[PDB]
Symmetry: C3
Subunit: 258 residues, 3 copies
């Protein structure tokens, strides 16, 4: 899996314009929909228990985010997840805040036990707190082997590992940490890619790589204006990034282990 494969997956997301159903936090709804529209995908947000199962089945991908979770909303995520698995719709989870409060940790787990997930995307602390029922390259694998899915731990360096493989990504910019939704949007981007790419691990890597190179390009363009401009430039790049920009910038390293 390299730069060439990634770039090609980006073109397929644009060619099919995957409908991504997100049940996420109200701090990133607008950013997320705008990011997906820019990428070339079709976003849709639905949270009511009277329709999440109906919306998930006609979708290309379902993404769950607990950022500002509620009891009834968590209830809806699982309902939607079950409807999704029943129809072959890839499900991606973003364990926002897992470990911060007991409720988020419980909820993350709850969803993982009730929904066949295609991938989980979060920071190291969140993956660890979620998976740490008792007593990050090695963290990814163990988590991916245990939960049996694609574990994507993003940060200065991205660590994506699946049942038997491990990859590290080297793109993006530190400015991404100053924009709320950077992760929520990314997680949703991952869903858009899993919708057109049969291999989850490959979808994650491509989605994250495309996202990163887009962020670098926005970064240089943003010069030193600030967080506001960068945010705006990211939405622009997700649209202007080309299959080529990915090919010559994407840094994908297949980790050799045991």
């Amino acid at each position: 899996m390299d730069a060439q494969s990634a770039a090609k997956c980006l073109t397929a997301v644009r060619r099919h314009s995957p409908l991504v159903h997100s049940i996420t936090n109200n701090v990133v709804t607008n950013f997320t929909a705008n990011g997906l529209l820019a990428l070339g995908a079709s976003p849709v947000m639905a949270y009511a228990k009277e329709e999440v199962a109906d919306m998930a089945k006609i979708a290309g991908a379902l993404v769950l985010n607990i950022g500002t979770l509620s009891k009834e909303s968590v209830e809806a995520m699982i309902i939607a997840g079950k409807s999704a698995n029943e129809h072959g719709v890839p499900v991606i989870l973003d364990p926002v805040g897992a470990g911060a409060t007991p409720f988020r940790t419980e909820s993350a787990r709850d969803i993982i036990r009730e929904v066949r997930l295609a991938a989980i995307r979060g920071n190291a602390a969140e993956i660890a707190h979620t998976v740490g029922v008792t007593d990050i390259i090695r963290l990814a694998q163990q988590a991916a082997q245990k939960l049996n899915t694609v574990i994507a731990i993003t940060g200065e360096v991205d660590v994506i590992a699946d049942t038997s493989h491990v990859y590290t990504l080297h793109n993006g910019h530190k400015l991404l940490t100053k924009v709320t939704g950077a992760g929520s949007l990314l997680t949703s981007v991952v869903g858009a890619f899993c919708a057109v790419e049969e291999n989850p691990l490959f979808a994650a890597i491509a989605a994250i790589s495309s996202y990163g190179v887009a962020a670098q390009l926005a970064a240089q363009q943003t010069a030193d204006k600030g967080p506001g401009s960068f945010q705006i430039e990211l939405l622009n790049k997700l649209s202007t990034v080309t299959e080529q920009d990915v090919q010559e910038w994407a840094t994908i390293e297949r980790v050799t282990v045991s």
Copy 2:
């Protein structure tokens, strides 16, 4: 504040009359109360403020009735609807109708799921609507059909005739109609398809105009045209930059577009019918 800026007795709703309505909106700065989806809250409010109106969001049943009666226009949006929201939307719709406040509906997603479809229909049965804005499919599921897939008149006008309201089906070409009149607008830019809320914001702008224009057909036409021109103006400064810059520019133009810009750029076409 709701007067009339054009009458068919003077001819077809035109470009100058629409320019008139824009100044009127900015003169009175109507308080536009919208019970909308949480994907477009911030953008809606910023767009309305840029235009010159007064945005306000209130969803609680404990207050919607009160907020609606002192509003210039009420706008209902089911983008991320819930049972509570719909009940609220109807509570407020009724109170708005009871106080003569024009109510605008944006059937976001009608058709995608039967829940959105039923809710949109529940609102229409319970609330008198001044206008309804949405795309071709949403409009079709809201009013009736079966075999989805002649909108530039037929659908728009027949929809208006059944629900006795104003039907505005936006798109590359816009079809606005009431029980016996229909128009087509040719303003805007393709980049509005890349901004979330572009339509929810527009339905809101429709509310503001309805608050200053007695005739909803006219208010709707003036609203969409001013919105489209601003869009056009916005795309020019930022077409090579991307959706992000466009989004921001659109907000900039909604405040700097003048009635001059609207009178000279607006392209409104009266459709011969019946």
Copy 3:
């Protein structure tokens, strides 16, 4: 007692400690608030569920309650979280958005005051007056701070801030903030940010509002005649860009004799 040089000193403190500001606010300003705080140098977090508000607040640096789009459930949650804050010495800030415009907002605002010890209350003259009751702006702020034994920050053209025995007048910011939704909500949260590192609440409010106002000014010059949209973005950049220096320079703080 408090001046520009000290104000700027606080801005540095915020960025140094990057306090966790817990906001239970309206869904019209959530994305703007988190981005604004991030650019400033604070760490925002939003949590509304009663199954976690007490837990999130006790681990925060400051709690802010904004009733912009209030519901019965969120108001009860704001109180539950308020009390938890009180018990852990976490400053609480209240933004009575719309108080006086609707009876429910008025009562929800008063109910919160009755149950939660607050460090400050930020809002426009009308909201403060309808909330606290009737006894210019300087007299109003002073009487209010005295009755509720808290800090009253009535922003606007000229900012009037006062605790039970002191009153200050601020003269920064720019008119365009009037055209950006959430300008007040982000400010309140900014206030919470300053309260998280400045022991005296009155000094905190002043420092927060001055910094915010200077940033607003700078963004407006760079914005000029472009529009509300470009301003909103520039404001985000400036909350990141503005320096201790800029505050010491532009900050215009004035103590009133009464």
